[PDB]
Symmetry: C6
Subunit: 29 residues, 6 copies
Amino acid sequence: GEIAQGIKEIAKGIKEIAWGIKEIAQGIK
Amino acid sequence: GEIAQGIKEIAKGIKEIAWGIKEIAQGI
Amino acid sequence: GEIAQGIKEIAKGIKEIAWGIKEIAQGIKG
Amino acid sequence: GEIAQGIKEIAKGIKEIAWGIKEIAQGIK
Amino acid sequence: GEIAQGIKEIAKGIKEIAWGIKEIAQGI
Amino acid sequence: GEIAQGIKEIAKGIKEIAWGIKEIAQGIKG
């Protein structure tokens, strides 16, 4: 499904955002 | 299903983003 | 439902992100 | 609906995140 | 419906967040 | 669908946010 695909792509991007935010948080410390 | 799984994975990632944002806010 | 629960947990996390971003924005004012 | 309510609350929080990010972006300049 | 409207408003807010993040990245 | 379109536009914006966050993270390395 187009919706199923979109949700999968959002999940992937959110995982990448979570990683980058942790990098920023550690990089500020 | 696949949608239920995707929503669960998004919820998990958003919880992790919320924690990291709090760490940035405290770190600043 | 599992979807209903997931959406509720996303709403909760988004509220927490919104709070932290506001704290950062104010904290950059010093 | 619980889903309808959740989506409304997410939309509200995303609007607030958009505002705060713009504040940070301007505050960095 | 209400869900379709909410998803449209989320899409709009995410576009605005994407622009602001790019401004921060360029500003840094 | 309107929902299908909205989800696609969210996916696109989230990919762009992910890119910008990576740029910030690397840019904080200098």
